[PDB]
Amino acid sequence: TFVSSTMVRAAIRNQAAQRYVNRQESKLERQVRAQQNVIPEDPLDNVFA
Amino acid sequence: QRSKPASENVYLKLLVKLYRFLARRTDSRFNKAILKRLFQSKTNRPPISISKIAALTSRKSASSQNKTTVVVGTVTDDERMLTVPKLSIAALRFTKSARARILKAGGEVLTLDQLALRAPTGSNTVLVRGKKHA
Amino acid sequence: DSVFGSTTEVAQLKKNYFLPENIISNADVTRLINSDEIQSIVKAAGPSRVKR
Amino acid sequence: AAARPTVSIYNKDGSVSSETLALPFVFKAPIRPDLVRSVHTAVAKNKRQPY
Amino acid sequence: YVKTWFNQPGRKLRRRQARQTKAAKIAPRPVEAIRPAVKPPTIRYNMKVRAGRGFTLEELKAAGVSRRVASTIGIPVDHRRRNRSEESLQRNVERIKVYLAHLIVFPRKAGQPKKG
RNA sequence: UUGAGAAGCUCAGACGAGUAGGCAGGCGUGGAGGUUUGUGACGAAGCCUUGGGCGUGAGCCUGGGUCGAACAGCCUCUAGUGCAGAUCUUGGUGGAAGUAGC
RNA sequence: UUUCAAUGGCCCGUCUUGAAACACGGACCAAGGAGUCUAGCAUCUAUGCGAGUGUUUGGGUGAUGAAAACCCAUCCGCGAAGGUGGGAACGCCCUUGUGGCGUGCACCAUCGAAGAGCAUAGCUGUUGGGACCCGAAAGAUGGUGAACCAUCUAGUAGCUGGUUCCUGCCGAAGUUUCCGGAUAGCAGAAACUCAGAUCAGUUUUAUGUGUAAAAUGAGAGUU
């Protein structure tokens, strides 16, 4: 008949532990796409610069 | 009822000024519809994702040809899909992630002013909307 | 060119900052309306003031 | 957005110089009197003292 | 009972001014002492790395610094922390060794009695 | 034909009670950043006046008399911001009354 | 402007009462004088960004107030975890118009089983906080010579009296129904779909007073 009330206390801990690692991964995955999804140089904009 | 936007984006009061003339001086319903939606609140203009646009043009029989999708509102991307198709899109706003993704692989992005000078009557344009429920 | 950036590149000094992208490109409306590509397709013109 | 590629640098004596600078990309950004007002409106309450 | 944060720009400048007098008193040495690298003691952050309090006695002896002098060249000591994993001993010994690479030590004059 | 403050100009028709209540546009006060390259000892602010005007109105502009050192229009910011009452607070002042009376 | 002539007009506010009657409050003038400040929640709108979002705990910095501005490290919070028809918009036409052929958004029917937030500002609403303003014997602690003083105290209210500039538009209900309430209804405010569609404190026709199907009008119905 299920675990313990304080053993469901850890059920948040096995829910919250993978928060920080997920968030850090989301930070680098967003940055990785940022390098990928960038506009090219537009070689015509160095005529005056 | 609604005949003046609640906005104060000065450039949206110039976009409306262009489509108030077009709506009343052409017989197309695309312009009368576009003008109405330039009056709608931010809540009533949902974001329309790139993938949702990509599905609509390439829907059922596909045959996208070179139709231009038009939406009043932002066009946020969808990183959950890798290969974006060629698209010509007109919208009030894009997201820098989305606009790069359209530009990098395929066609071009447009603002509502560049669509008007190309298809003032709504010539061969798909007018879409995002999911309102939210 | 480095403190603000560009609408494509990013300011070297302000991290991840791109200049805003506008609702329209050509902000001059009277050119948008009074252009050929629109004035060639509008229907006829009524009087500016209609006589009583 | 097409406008005025180059600007001219003036020396101390007031005479123009042959060198020039491309007009920065910032100088084409949107001009928003409402957005500047509602930001200056706020940012100007930040050096206030309490009474 | 209500607190206001009007002295928030006052307190920050007081802290900066408090750092500058410390730098004035102790010129060559850094305003901050070195701290080790440790891992937070929880399943949520255990894969992270942050700073500790000081270097344990196995971290000092392995790196090659006695525990008594370590307090004097700015290396702080934590008698409570211990090394259970060698990767924790390794990340902090090399942290000491890189510090002693950049550490200039000023000689001190020493009493030299005529006899012995 | 000049009538693009497109937030403009123009045309047509019907309509108009109002409590509770809902919506909208404005007038006014103190101070705040911008502005009028603003006003002021050749007279600011204020005050009175059966002077002249403006606005449906809140209100405003001006003439005269006093007056003597400051003040305002415009765009925004802001709040200890609008009075006929509360046996309202404070000060002043009448009738009662030259009365009760001493 | 004062005055006269002719016509007129029961004292104002509150409360009461259908209404008054009332009972109140008002000797006069000036000044003071009452939805405010804040935390929480939800809504609408505006703005920035958008599968993201939020610099201001703090650090960096700021020579011309340096309590401003400007910049970002490590966290963290809140998010993120298929066919059928009707359909907006468009194209092709083609007896054109009429319509058809299509492509079919939002969404709704049907059969079924391609994220939209976050943050700031405003508005209105609500809950607390002294809580629109004024007013009920207090009580308690501690003092002074049953009495008196000082504070806690912004103690307590369904109640009483008051709550301040103008114009414009819309404008009820005044009560069913269950049951102090949840409904409803009236009024709005938004979003929708249609005038080739439905309606009506309507009237006829006729079938058996009800019901069903012609005129007279109005666009009507939803969430």
PDB file of all heavy atoms in Angstrom, chain E residues 28-48:
ATOM      1  N   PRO E  28      49.695  44.971  -2.256  1.00  0.00           N
ATOM      2  CA  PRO E  28      49.976  43.894  -3.212  1.00  0.00           C
ATOM      3  C   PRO E  28      48.974  42.752  -3.159  1.00  0.00           C
ATOM      4  O   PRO E  28      48.661  42.187  -4.205  1.00  0.00           O
ATOM      5  CB  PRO E  28      51.368  43.393  -2.781  1.00  0.00           C
ATOM      6  CG  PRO E  28      51.848  44.328  -1.717  1.00  0.00           C
ATOM      7  CD  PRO E  28      50.624  44.940  -1.117  1.00  0.00           C
ATOM      8  N   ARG E  29      48.453  42.426  -1.984  1.00  0.00           N
ATOM      9  CA  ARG E  29      47.583  41.251  -1.875  1.00  0.00           C
ATOM     10  C   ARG E  29      46.187  41.595  -2.382  1.00  0.00           C
ATOM     11  O   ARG E  29      45.737  42.736  -2.241  1.00  0.00           O
ATOM     12  CB  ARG E  29      47.495  40.769  -0.434  1.00  0.00           C
ATOM     13  CG  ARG E  29      47.906  41.780   0.634  1.00  0.00           C
ATOM     14  CD  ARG E  29      47.788  41.206   2.045  1.00  0.00           C
ATOM     15  NE  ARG E  29      46.416  41.203   2.534  1.00  0.00           N
ATOM     16  CZ  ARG E  29      46.043  40.754   3.725  1.00  0.00           C
ATOM     17  NH1 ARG E  29      46.921  40.277   4.594  1.00  0.00           N
ATOM     18  NH2 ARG E  29      44.760  40.797   4.057  1.00  0.00           N
ATOM     19  N   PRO E  30      45.475  40.624  -2.927  1.00  0.00           N
ATOM     20  CA  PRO E  30      44.114  40.871  -3.398  1.00  0.00           C
ATOM     21  C   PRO E  30      43.160  41.182  -2.251  1.00  0.00           C
ATOM     22  O   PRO E  30      43.337  40.743  -1.109  1.00  0.00           O
ATOM     23  CB  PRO E  30      43.736  39.537  -4.075  1.00  0.00           C
ATOM     24  CG  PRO E  30      44.701  38.548  -3.512  1.00  0.00           C
ATOM     25  CD  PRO E  30      45.961  39.272  -3.286  1.00  0.00           C
ATOM     26  N   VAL E  31      42.113  41.938  -2.575  1.00  0.00           N
ATOM     27  CA  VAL E  31      41.106  42.289  -1.578  1.00  0.00           C
ATOM     28  C   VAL E  31      40.332  41.070  -1.107  1.00  0.00           C
ATOM     29  O   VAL E  31      39.715  41.104  -0.046  1.00  0.00           O
ATOM     30  CB  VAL E  31      40.156  43.352  -2.144  1.00  0.00           C
ATOM     31  CG1 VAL E  31      40.948  44.537  -2.619  1.00  0.00           C
ATOM     32  CG2 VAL E  31      39.337  42.771  -3.260  1.00  0.00           C
ATOM     33  N   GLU E  32      40.353  39.987  -1.874  1.00  0.00           N
ATOM     34  CA  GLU E  32      39.618  38.773  -1.555  1.00  0.00           C
ATOM     35  C   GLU E  32      40.582  37.602  -1.423  1.00  0.00           C
ATOM     36  O   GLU E  32      41.540  37.493  -2.185  1.00  0.00           O
ATOM     37  CB  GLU E  32      38.599  38.474  -2.642  1.00  0.00           C
ATOM     38  CG  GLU E  32      37.238  39.062  -2.419  1.00  0.00           C
ATOM     39  CD  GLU E  32      36.213  38.443  -3.343  1.00  0.00           C
ATOM     40  OE1 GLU E  32      36.562  37.450  -4.015  1.00  0.00           O
ATOM     41  OE2 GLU E  32      35.070  38.943  -3.405  1.00  0.00           O
ATOM     42  N   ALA E  33      40.322  36.724  -0.463  1.00  0.00           N
ATOM     43  CA  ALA E  33      41.110  35.510  -0.348  1.00  0.00           C
ATOM     44  C   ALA E  33      40.607  34.454  -1.322  1.00  0.00           C
ATOM     45  O   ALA E  33      39.461  34.483  -1.774  1.00  0.00           O
ATOM     46  CB  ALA E  33      41.067  34.965   1.077  1.00  0.00           C
ATOM     47  N   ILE E  34      41.489  33.511  -1.651  1.00  0.00           N
ATOM     48  CA  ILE E  34      41.117  32.444  -2.566  1.00  0.00           C
ATOM     49  C   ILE E  34      40.151  31.493  -1.873  1.00  0.00           C
ATOM     50  O   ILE E  34      40.234  31.261  -0.663  1.00  0.00           O
ATOM     51  CB  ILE E  34      42.365  31.702  -3.074  1.00  0.00           C
ATOM     52  CG1 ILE E  34      41.965  30.632  -4.081  1.00  0.00           C
ATOM     53  CG2 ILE E  34      43.099  31.074  -1.933  1.00  0.00           C
ATOM     54  CD1 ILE E  34      43.054  30.225  -4.999  1.00  0.00           C
ATOM     55  N   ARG E  35      39.205  30.954  -2.637  1.00  0.00           N
ATOM     56  CA  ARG E  35      38.297  29.949  -2.126  1.00  0.00           C
ATOM     57  C   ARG E  35      38.352  28.715  -3.013  1.00  0.00           C
ATOM     58  O   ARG E  35      38.668  28.824  -4.201  1.00  0.00           O
ATOM     59  CB  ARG E  35      36.862  30.472  -2.070  1.00  0.00           C
ATOM     60  CG  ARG E  35      36.708  31.782  -1.368  1.00  0.00           C
ATOM     61  CD  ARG E  35      36.687  31.608   0.126  1.00  0.00           C
ATOM     62  NE  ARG E  35      37.122  32.818   0.809  1.00  0.00           N
ATOM     63  CZ  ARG E  35      37.537  32.850   2.064  1.00  0.00           C
ATOM     64  NH1 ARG E  35      37.545  31.762   2.818  1.00  0.00           N
ATOM     65  NH2 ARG E  35      37.954  34.002   2.579  1.00  0.00           N
ATOM     66  N   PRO E  36      38.066  27.534  -2.471  1.00  0.00           N
ATOM     67  CA  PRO E  36      38.143  26.303  -3.254  1.00  0.00           C
ATOM     68  C   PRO E  36      36.881  26.087  -4.078  1.00  0.00           C
ATOM     69  O   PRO E  36      35.935  26.858  -4.024  1.00  0.00           O
ATOM     70  CB  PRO E  36      38.297  25.233  -2.182  1.00  0.00           C
ATOM     71  CG  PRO E  36      37.614  25.776  -1.028  1.00  0.00           C
ATOM     72  CD  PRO E  36      37.829  27.249  -1.050  1.00  0.00           C
ATOM     73  N   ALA E  37      36.889  25.006  -4.851  1.00  0.00           N
ATOM     74  CA  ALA E  37      35.739  24.580  -5.637  1.00  0.00           C
ATOM     75  C   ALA E  37      35.128  23.350  -4.983  1.00  0.00           C
ATOM     76  O   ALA E  37      35.827  22.366  -4.730  1.00  0.00           O
ATOM     77  CB  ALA E  37      36.133  24.284  -7.084  1.00  0.00           C
ATOM     78  N   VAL E  38      33.833  23.423  -4.687  1.00  0.00           N
ATOM     79  CA  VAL E  38      33.097  22.348  -4.044  1.00  0.00           C
ATOM     80  C   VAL E  38      31.771  22.181  -4.770  1.00  0.00           C
ATOM     81  O   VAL E  38      31.387  22.997  -5.606  1.00  0.00           O
ATOM     82  CB  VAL E  38      32.854  22.613  -2.546  1.00  0.00           C
ATOM     83  CG1 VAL E  38      34.122  23.035  -1.861  1.00  0.00           C
ATOM     84  CG2 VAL E  38      31.815  23.665  -2.380  1.00  0.00           C
ATOM     85  N   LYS E  39      31.062  21.116  -4.425  1.00  0.00           N
ATOM     86  CA  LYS E  39      29.791  20.826  -5.060  1.00  0.00           C
ATOM     87  C   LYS E  39      28.651  20.901  -4.055  1.00  0.00           C
ATOM     88  O   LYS E  39      28.771  20.376  -2.948  1.00  0.00           O
ATOM     89  CB  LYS E  39      29.818  19.434  -5.696  1.00  0.00           C
ATOM     90  CG  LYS E  39      30.745  19.325  -6.892  1.00  0.00           C
ATOM     91  CD  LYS E  39      30.435  18.089  -7.701  1.00  0.00           C
ATOM     92  CE  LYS E  39      31.193  18.063  -9.014  1.00  0.00           C
ATOM     93  NZ  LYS E  39      30.543  18.877 -10.068  1.00  0.00           N
ATOM     94  N   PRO E  40      27.543  21.540  -4.406  1.00  0.00           N
ATOM     95  CA  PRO E  40      26.430  21.674  -3.468  1.00  0.00           C
ATOM     96  C   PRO E  40      25.884  20.319  -3.057  1.00  0.00           C
ATOM     97  O   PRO E  40      25.801  19.395  -3.876  1.00  0.00           O
ATOM     98  CB  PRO E  40      25.396  22.481  -4.265  1.00  0.00           C
ATOM     99  CG  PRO E  40      26.188  23.199  -5.293  1.00  0.00           C
ATOM    100  CD  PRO E  40      27.301  22.268  -5.657  1.00  0.00           C
ATOM    101  N   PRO E  41      25.483  20.167  -1.793  1.00  0.00           N
ATOM    102  CA  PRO E  41      25.217  18.846  -1.218  1.00  0.00           C
ATOM    103  C   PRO E  41      23.776  18.382  -1.364  1.00  0.00           C
ATOM    104  O   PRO E  41      23.118  18.012  -0.386  1.00  0.00           O
ATOM    105  CB  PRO E  41      25.569  19.058   0.256  1.00  0.00           C
ATOM    106  CG  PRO E  41      25.148  20.450   0.507  1.00  0.00           C
ATOM    107  CD  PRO E  41      25.308  21.220  -0.784  1.00  0.00           C
ATOM    108  N   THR E  42      23.275  18.374  -2.591  1.00  0.00           N
ATOM    109  CA  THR E  42      21.872  18.074  -2.810  1.00  0.00           C
ATOM    110  C   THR E  42      21.758  17.434  -4.182  1.00  0.00           C
ATOM    111  O   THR E  42      22.568  17.715  -5.061  1.00  0.00           O
ATOM    112  CB  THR E  42      21.030  19.358  -2.674  1.00  0.00           C
ATOM    113  OG1 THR E  42      20.804  19.639  -1.287  1.00  0.00           O
ATOM    114  CG2 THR E  42      19.688  19.245  -3.361  1.00  0.00           C
ATOM    115  N   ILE E  43      20.778  16.541  -4.347  1.00  0.00           N
ATOM    116  CA  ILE E  43      20.528  15.919  -5.645  1.00  0.00           C
ATOM    117  C   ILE E  43      20.187  16.944  -6.713  1.00  0.00           C
ATOM    118  O   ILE E  43      20.359  16.672  -7.904  1.00  0.00           O
ATOM    119  CB  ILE E  43      19.397  14.875  -5.531  1.00  0.00           C
ATOM    120  CG1 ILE E  43      19.347  13.994  -6.780  1.00  0.00           C
ATOM    121  CG2 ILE E  43      18.062  15.552  -5.271  1.00  0.00           C
ATOM    122  CD1 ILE E  43      20.659  13.378  -7.154  1.00  0.00           C
ATOM    123  N   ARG E  44      19.701  18.122  -6.316  1.00  0.00           N
ATOM    124  CA  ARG E  44      19.299  19.134  -7.285  1.00  0.00           C
ATOM    125  C   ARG E  44      20.494  19.843  -7.910  1.00  0.00           C
ATOM    126  O   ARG E  44      20.497  20.107  -9.116  1.00  0.00           O
ATOM    127  CB  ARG E  44      18.368  20.145  -6.631  1.00  0.00           C
ATOM    128  CG  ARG E  44      17.925  21.225  -7.571  1.00  0.00           C
ATOM    129  CD  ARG E  44      16.684  21.902  -7.064  1.00  0.00           C
ATOM    130  NE  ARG E  44      16.410  23.136  -7.788  1.00  0.00           N
ATOM    131  CZ  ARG E  44      15.508  24.030  -7.412  1.00  0.00           C
ATOM    132  NH1 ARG E  44      14.760  23.845  -6.339  1.00  0.00           N
ATOM    133  NH2 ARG E  44      15.351  25.134  -8.132  1.00  0.00           N
ATOM    134  N   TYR E  45      21.512  20.168  -7.115  1.00  0.00           N
ATOM    135  CA  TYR E  45      22.659  20.921  -7.608  1.00  0.00           C
ATOM    136  C   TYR E  45      23.962  20.139  -7.566  1.00  0.00           C
ATOM    137  O   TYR E  45      25.025  20.745  -7.721  1.00  0.00           O
ATOM    138  CB  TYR E  45      22.858  22.213  -6.812  1.00  0.00           C
ATOM    139  CG  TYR E  45      21.659  23.115  -6.673  1.00  0.00           C
ATOM    140  CD1 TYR E  45      20.818  23.005  -5.582  1.00  0.00           C
ATOM    141  CD2 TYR E  45      21.396  24.100  -7.604  1.00  0.00           C
ATOM    142  CE1 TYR E  45      19.737  23.824  -5.438  1.00  0.00           C
ATOM    143  CE2 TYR E  45      20.313  24.923  -7.470  1.00  0.00           C
ATOM    144  CZ  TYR E  45      19.484  24.781  -6.385  1.00  0.00           C
ATOM    145  OH  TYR E  45      18.394  25.605  -6.238  1.00  0.00           O
ATOM    146  N   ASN E  46      23.928  18.825  -7.352  1.00  0.00           N
ATOM    147  CA  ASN E  46      25.174  18.112  -7.097  1.00  0.00           C
ATOM    148  C   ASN E  46      26.119  18.127  -8.290  1.00  0.00           C
ATOM    149  O   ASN E  46      27.331  18.038  -8.097  1.00  0.00           O
ATOM    150  CB  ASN E  46      24.891  16.675  -6.655  1.00  0.00           C
ATOM    151  CG  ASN E  46      24.291  15.827  -7.751  1.00  0.00           C
ATOM    152  OD1 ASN E  46      23.090  15.637  -7.810  1.00  0.00           O
ATOM    153  ND2 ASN E  46      25.132  15.324  -8.637  1.00  0.00           N
ATOM    154  N   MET E  47      25.609  18.289  -9.501  1.00  0.00           N
ATOM    155  CA  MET E  47      26.449  18.373 -10.687  1.00  0.00           C
ATOM    156  C   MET E  47      27.053  19.754 -10.885  1.00  0.00           C
ATOM    157  O   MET E  47      27.875  19.932 -11.786  1.00  0.00           O
ATOM    158  CB  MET E  47      25.651  17.964 -11.930  1.00  0.00           C
ATOM    159  CG  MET E  47      24.967  19.093 -12.671  1.00  0.00           C
ATOM    160  SD  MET E  47      23.878  20.133 -11.679  1.00  0.00           S
ATOM    161  CE  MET E  47      22.918  18.923 -10.780  1.00  0.00           C
ATOM    162  N   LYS E  48      26.679  20.725 -10.060  1.00  0.00           N
ATOM    163  CA  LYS E  48      27.222  22.069 -10.136  1.00  0.00           C
ATOM    164  C   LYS E  48      28.589  22.127  -9.462  1.00  0.00           C
ATOM    165  O   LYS E  48      29.007  21.206  -8.762  1.00  0.00           O
ATOM    166  CB  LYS E  48      26.262  23.052  -9.474  1.00  0.00           C
ATOM    167  CG  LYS E  48      26.437  24.491  -9.882  1.00  0.00           C
ATOM    168  CD  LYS E  48      25.448  25.376  -9.175  1.00  0.00           C
ATOM    169  CE  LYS E  48      25.583  26.787  -9.660  1.00  0.00           C
ATOM    170  NZ  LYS E  48      26.991  27.206  -9.548  1.00  0.00           N
TER     171      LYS E  48
END
